[PDB]
Amino acid sequence: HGEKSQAAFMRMRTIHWYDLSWSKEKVKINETVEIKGKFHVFEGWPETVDEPDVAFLNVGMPGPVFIRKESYIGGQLVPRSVRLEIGKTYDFRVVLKARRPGDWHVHTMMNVQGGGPIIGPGKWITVEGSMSEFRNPVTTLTGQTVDLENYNEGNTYFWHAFWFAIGVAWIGYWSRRPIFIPRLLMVDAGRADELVSATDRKVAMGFLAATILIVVMAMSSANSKYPITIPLQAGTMRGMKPLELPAPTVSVKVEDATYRVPGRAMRMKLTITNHGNSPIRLGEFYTASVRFLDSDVYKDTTGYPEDLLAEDGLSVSDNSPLAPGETRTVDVTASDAAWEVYRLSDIIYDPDSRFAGLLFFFDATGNRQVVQIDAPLIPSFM
Amino acid sequence: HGEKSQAAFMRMRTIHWYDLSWSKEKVKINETVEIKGKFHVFEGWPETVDEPDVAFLNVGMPGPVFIRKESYIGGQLVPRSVRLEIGKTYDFRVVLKARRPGDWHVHTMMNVQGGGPIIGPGKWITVEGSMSEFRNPVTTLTGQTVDLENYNEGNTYFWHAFWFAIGVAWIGYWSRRPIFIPRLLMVDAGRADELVSATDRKVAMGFLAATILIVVMAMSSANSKYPITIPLQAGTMRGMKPLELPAPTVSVKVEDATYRVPGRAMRMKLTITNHGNSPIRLGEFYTASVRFLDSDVYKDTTGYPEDLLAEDGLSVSDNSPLAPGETRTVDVTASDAAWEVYRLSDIIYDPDSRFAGLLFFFDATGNRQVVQIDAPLIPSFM
Amino acid sequence: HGEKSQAAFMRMRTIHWYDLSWSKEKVKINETVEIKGKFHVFEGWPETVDEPDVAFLNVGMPGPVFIRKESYIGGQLVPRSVRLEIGKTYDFRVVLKARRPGDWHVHTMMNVQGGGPIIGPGKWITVEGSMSEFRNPVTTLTGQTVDLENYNEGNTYFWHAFWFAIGVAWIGYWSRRPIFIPRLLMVDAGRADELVSATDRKVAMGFLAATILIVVMAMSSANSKYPITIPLQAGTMRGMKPLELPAPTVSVKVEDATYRVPGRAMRMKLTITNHGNSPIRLGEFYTASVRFLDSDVYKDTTGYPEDLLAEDGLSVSDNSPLAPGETRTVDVTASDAAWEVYRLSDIIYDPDSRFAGLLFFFDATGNRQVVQIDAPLIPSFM
Ligand SMILES: CCCCCCC/C=C/CCCCCCCC(=O)OC[C@H](COP(=O)(O)OCCN)OC(=O)CCCCCCCCCCCCCCC
Ligand SMILES: CCCCCCC/C=C/CCCCCCCC(=O)OC[C@H](COP(=O)(O)OCCN)OC(=O)CCCCCCCCCCCCCCC
Ligand SMILES: CCCCCCC/C=C/CCCCCCCC(=O)OC[C@H](COP(=O)(O)OCCN)OC(=O)CCCCCCCCCCCCCCC
Ligand SMILES: CCCCCCC/C=C/CCCCCCCC(=O)OC[C@H](COP(=O)(O)OCCN)OC(=O)CCCCCCCCCCCCCCC
Ligand SMILES: CCCCCCC/C=C/CCCCCCCC(=O)OC[C@H](COP(=O)(O)OCCN)OC(=O)CCCCCCCCCCCCCCC
Ligand SMILES: CCCCCCC/C=C/CCCCCCCC(=O)OC[C@H](COP(=O)(O)OCCN)OC(=O)CCCCCCCCCCCCCCC
Ligand SMILES: CCCCCCC/C=C\CCCCCCCC(=O)OC[C@H](COP(=O)(O)OCCN)OC(=O)CCCCCCCCCCCCCCC
Numbered sequence A, B, C: 001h002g003e004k005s006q007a008a009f010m011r012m013r014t015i016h017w018y019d020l021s022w023s024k025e026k027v028k029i030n031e032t033v034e035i036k037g038k039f040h041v042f043e044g045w046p047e048t049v050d051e052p053d054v055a056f057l058n059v060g061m062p063g064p065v066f067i068r069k070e071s072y073i074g075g076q077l078v079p080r081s082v083r084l085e086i087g088k089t090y091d092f093r094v095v096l097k098a099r100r101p102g103d104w105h106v107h108t109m110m111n112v113q114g115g116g117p118i119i120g121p122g123k124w125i126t127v128e129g130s131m132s133e134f135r136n137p138v139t140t141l142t143g144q145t146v147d148l149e150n151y152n153e154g155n156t157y158f159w160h161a162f163w164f165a166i167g168v169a170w171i172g173y174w175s176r177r178p179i180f181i182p183r184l185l186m187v188d189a190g191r192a193d194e195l196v197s198a199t200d201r202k203v204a205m206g207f208l209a210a211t212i213l214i215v216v217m218a219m220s221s222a223n224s225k226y227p228i229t230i231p232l233q234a235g236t237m238r239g240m241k242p243l244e245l246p247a248p249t250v251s252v253k254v255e256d257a258t259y260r261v262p263g264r265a266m267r268m269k270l271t272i273t274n275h276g277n278s279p280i281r282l283g284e285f286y287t288a289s290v291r292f293l294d295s296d297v298y299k300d301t302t303g304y305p306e307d308l309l310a311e312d313g314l315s316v317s318d319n320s321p322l323a324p325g326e327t328r329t330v331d332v333t334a335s336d337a338a339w340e341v342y343r344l345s346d347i348i349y350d351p352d353s354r355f356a357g358l359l360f361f362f363d364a365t366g367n368r369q370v371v372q373i374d375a376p377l378i379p380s381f382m
């Protein structure tokens, strides 16, 4: 939730999430779900979004209904912010543990500093069980195993209640006497010195000394109880390993790209050159989490969110085997209610009417090439 | 105009504009002139100029004597700011349309954010005709063809005059009575409440209600008249395609570079190694829009501004065919009044006495290699 | 001095200084000492240190006990700040001239803007002689040879004394009369106009006119005496040539890296793959200026500061010739008091417990390969 309201061109021109898998659709409490996939950083990064020099891989959900057990970018655990390079592709994996029952829309997201949220496709996952069964065991380097759900709760309650009680006692010591009107009149009359006695001064001295001594003793006792402590671990982790992918033996030029403004579709003229890899055929156009597929060339079998999957939303004028070398100019039409449901038609309000997306080409043997396209998008009103 | 006053080293060390062409020297009104060429970004970019992450290709002229019909960087239209990389070469093309008659010095420039203006060579172009004949037709996506010279002029005049008249009427309603002295005396005397009557309150209420209602009705009518509107299109366009140029089979090392301070020339010792490409010969040294040529090796036939063209300003101790492999140390002398006219001799006031420029080598067949040189420049006073 | 107090991980993860040489250990006054070596910029640059876009090569010493005659980065003199790239290796050379007698700990350092100091290994150098024998001759472009120790000293003294005397005379002219109490009483009584006479006004006018005229005449005389002047030369020098080094035919993966917190050592599990270059053997681990060596494989003969040299501080479970192709998992133990002396054990207070260092592999013929390792460092308390 939160993507439909984001500018259409910003969603089109930031990060592209390609083949994704979810290990389970329905999980029990304390069971783990794995979300893997690839994300590509668009070369034409918008200028109002800072470069992903400081980026964090996040899980979009209405709260800690899951707990993120681990997250890996390129096989490396990423508990901190990371640095990503423009134009590179990265594998990502996220292992989550179920905490609260219910149906949850879970998304993979990249939070970018100086940019904001970049939400990926969301999937509905059902958690069955009771929240009281959730456990979060962690073993420390000191040899102690604790449960993070209730660890250190009683100590915090005790100390906060103790200090609150001390403050309440300090206020109530003075609250046993007339408070506001008689004291104000006495101060106005010049009898302020009569409002504080020697016993009050001794009580204040005792309160101050007891507070300081208790703080010192509590710090000493806490140090004795936990002689081994480390500061909070923070920093930006550089040197993320990107994917070394086969360059596309397929070249695609966008002649024109238009959308009818009333409109639930997008149309584009494309010149495609096959540089080998056998006769190929376009099977899918990915724009903003929406996948328009050509049923005759490719069929999704990964449980891609159906609200974002158009099984026959790709209409190519001529989708015949493009013999290696053939340069065919084709008119592709990407049509689906998701265009209007995911407010991609709101590119009419955007201060930049340019789109970007991914095209997937398959040969007879099923090998897939990914081609990256970007162009300006012209609205049609006649 | 405006380059002679810019620091000599800043002009030497930012952008180099090489082979340029102008389609016409004399044009009529509404006729188009094309300026094409190449620009190279110097690797040793000055630190006080921000990197050209946000750069705009501009035309330097005393105003809209021309209108910039289009501009292309690497074959791509660039109506917005673009991103350029240090050390890369780009083709550029600018098509301008003549608007005002007269002789105009036209320059191609790169405005760089956090840096300032980078002016290129200027050429004198004559426009013959009358300004009243200039037309700027534009066809909109709604099917309307308009002339940008006078489009929406009458509407703006009408609305501004209407609101100015309303304000004048509001002031003049109160201006029919004594204004300053009697009213001031009455306010001082305590008779302020007598200065505003019930009729005045009713008039003020009517003015407020009429203003609000007129604004609302005008907005509704404007929306009805123009139901299709888009916001201003802005942004920085990345992914500019640079030139893939042959690396210079010629290696040049600058041993020493000196200039006499009184002085109208510059001298340099150079070690040149030919790595193939047949016997070569130096034909031209480009510094800051100034081209020093060796008449025996090369002759300009592009109409390069004569104030910046020194046909025999390159004197090479030995400019004989440098057999592939020969490593000759030569003393080159670049001499021309342009050195003093374009204030390149003002490098003596610069906080950085280092120069950069381009050397052009030609073989027997006429093939040209471009070598890029940079060194510190030492003034000579004895 | 000043490195032991710097965070251990910051010292481990910034710049690595490898093979270094000092021309002399004991020098006389006016004699020169050359310090050469290589420095590598770590790929995982810490986020709190700005990238070395503006870096200066500096000499760490308690003052001008030496004078830095020259400094070269990649064979190019670097009197100004320079730009360095992450992940590149550079040669550096520094020629210093002895000025003051005594024993001096001299370090090579890289000052990085927005980062702070990066100190390298320090060496003790003895200077014998008298400071009065030190000379700093410099020949100017005007044909004058001067000594920078005493040049322009007398002129500065004369002008400062002259202006101080003028100010003292101005104060003392008024100081001959009663100063504070009688004048205050007269001003309070309304007799302020009697405290300044016409002669005082004439004296003030003469002082003002003489000051302005003297300033103008002094400027004119200084211009006449030195008709050739240049501004201060400043700027950041880009285009530093890095080393083109053989990629390591040796691959090393860090399985685990741990240190006992009481502790004077560090332990690591490593998987090493030989990709040719004959049977190899680990001979040295460099962490933070500390070099742990395996005496049986390599011996230092460069006079590396002994406080930072552990001749037998590298213990490899199996350090037998790793036949090209062999993938052996070995347990290496780097032990030395320098770990505690140079406060590398203070990584326990660091907000980032990750280390980086260099491994040196030698074959039978003595050829050396450098492998770069980085991992998180886990403290052991049991
Ligand atoms: C829950 C209260 C709201 C917020 C409290 C915030 C800070 C505390 C303020 C007052 C503390 C001192 C009590 C008054 C002097 C406590 C005090 O003096 O009590 C005797 C009073 C005074 O004697 P008197 O002049 O002969 O009688 C006048 C009132 N009948 O008599 C009483 O019968 C008791 C009345 C006082 C009861 C108020 C207690 C509520 C405060 C404790 C709340 C603790 C929880 C805090 C978080 C919400
Ligand atoms: C690092 C330097 C210290 C900071 C400088 C200021 C220090 C001030 C000193 C007092 C100067 C004022 C004159 C008072 C003369 C001595 C003095 O302390 O008198 C009591 C004064 C009231 O002043 P007075 O009676 O008119 O003074 C005349 C002689 N008694 O109250 C206080 O000082 C505050 C309340 C009583 C203090 C008891 C200790 C509790 C507070 C400290 C914590 C102790 C427990 C430590 C935990 C381990
Ligand atoms: C061009 C004027 C300069 C700038 C104007 C700026 C804002 C407007 C100020 C005054 C408007 C109300 C007029 C006075 C009450 C208009 C008004 O009350 O006119 C009757 C006056 C007053 O009657 P009275 O007391 O019996 O006579 C005294 C003056 N003789 O009599 C007149 O004979 C007319 C004199 C007033 C003429 C001034 C008009 C100029 C202002 C309009 C300019 C519009 C263009 C604006 C942009 C420049
Ligand atoms: C979103 C919330 C609204 C903002 C809150 C403030 C609103 C204020 C309300 C009035 C409170 C003061 C008491 C007045 C009582 C009602 C009232 O409006 O009285 C007239 C008052 C003068 O006060 P009064 O006579 O002593 O009031 C006693 C009873 N009449 O003048 C005004 O309110 C201003 C001039 C007359 C207003 C006429 C409408 C023109 C202005 C609004 C635009 C209407 C056209 C819309 C275009 C589509
Ligand atoms: C070294 C002094 C410290 C700093 C000086 C800073 C600025 C100068 C202040 C005073 C200058 C005017 C002198 C007084 C009027 C100089 C002056 O009027 O001298 C005659 C006085 C006054 O005559 P009187 O009323 O009959 O006698 C009263 C004092 N006996 O008599 C004297 O016997 C001389 C006393 C004055 C000597 C003070 C001189 C010190 C200042 C010069 C220092 C220069 C070095 C500067 C850097 C440190
Ligand atoms: C660029 C524009 C200049 C700045 C504008 C202000 C200039 C001010 C002028 C004076 C106006 C006040 C009326 C005084 C009338 C003329 C005048 O200068 O009178 C003397 C006034 C005192 O005023 P007054 O006697 O009541 O004036 C009545 C007629 N004399 O003192 C001063 O002006 C200051 C002290 C005397 C000046 C002598 C010259 C020394 C200062 C300047 C440097 C000269 C040497 C140059 C070196 C090459
Ligand atoms: C959450 C836990 C709540 C803690 C509650 C603590 C109690 C707080 C205040 C008690 C007020 C009694 C005032 C009696 C003066 C009532 C009073 O003033 O009585 C006259 C005495 C006469 O004493 P004397 O013998 O003639 O002279 C002194 C030596 N003999 O004067 C005084 O000066 C008596 C001073 C006594 C002050 C006691 C207050 C100390 C409170 C510290 C509390 C510590 C916090 C808890 C620790 C875990």
Ligand SMILES: CCCCCCC/C=C\CCCCCCCC(=O)OC[C@H](COP(=O)(O)OCCN)OC(=O)CCCCCCCCCCCCCCC
Residues within 6 Å of the ligand: B162, B165, B166, B169, B198, B199, B200, B202, B203, B206, B207, B210
């Ligand atoms: C650029 C175009 C210029 C537009 C010029 C607009 C004219 C402006 C002001 C007229 C002043 C007349 C004042 C008469 C009070 C003169 C006045 O006060 O007369 C006494 C009346 C008595 O009226 P009554 O009948 O006894 O009671 C009300 C119901 N019957 O009192 C009032 O309260 C009369 C109020 C009348 C106010 C009229 C002003 C409205 C002006 C709106 C202009 C709209 C803008 C143009 C639209 C395109």
Ligand SMILES: CCCCCCC/C=C\CCCCCCCC(=O)OC[C@H](COP(=O)(O)OCCN)OC(=O)CCCCCCCCCCCCCCC
Residues within 6 Å of the ligand: C162, C165, C166, C169, C198, C199, C200, C202, C203, C206, C207, C210
């Ligand atoms: C470090 C070097 C130190 C320099 C010391 C300079 C001496 C400073 C002040 C002298 C005070 C004498 C005051 C006499 C008034 C004492 C005074 O006021 O005497 C009455 C005269 C009467 O003169 P008169 O003839 O009747 O009228 C004028 C034409 N004839 O009035 C005046 O107005 C006299 C004005 C004389 C002022 C002289 C002060 C000039 C000082 C400039 C110094 C230059 C700096 C050094 C250059 C290298």
Ligand SMILES: [Cu+2]
Residues within 6 Å of the ligand: A001, A002, A105, A106, A107, A122
């Ligand atoms: Cu959602």
Ligand SMILES: [Cu+2]
Residues within 6 Å of the ligand: A015, A016, A040, A041, A042, A043, A372
């Ligand atoms: Cu992409």
Ligand SMILES: [Cu+2]
Residues within 6 Å of the ligand: B001, B002, B105, B106, B107, B122
């Ligand atoms: Cu010009």
Ligand SMILES: [Cu+2]
Residues within 6 Å of the ligand: B015, B016, B040, B041, B042, B043, B372
């Ligand atoms: Cu260049």
Ligand SMILES: [Cu+2]
Residues within 6 Å of the ligand: C001, C002, C105, C106, C107, C122
């Ligand atoms: Cu030291």
Ligand SMILES: [Cu+2]
Residues within 6 Å of the ligand: C015, C016, C040, C041, C042, C043, C372
């Ligand atoms: Cu390194």
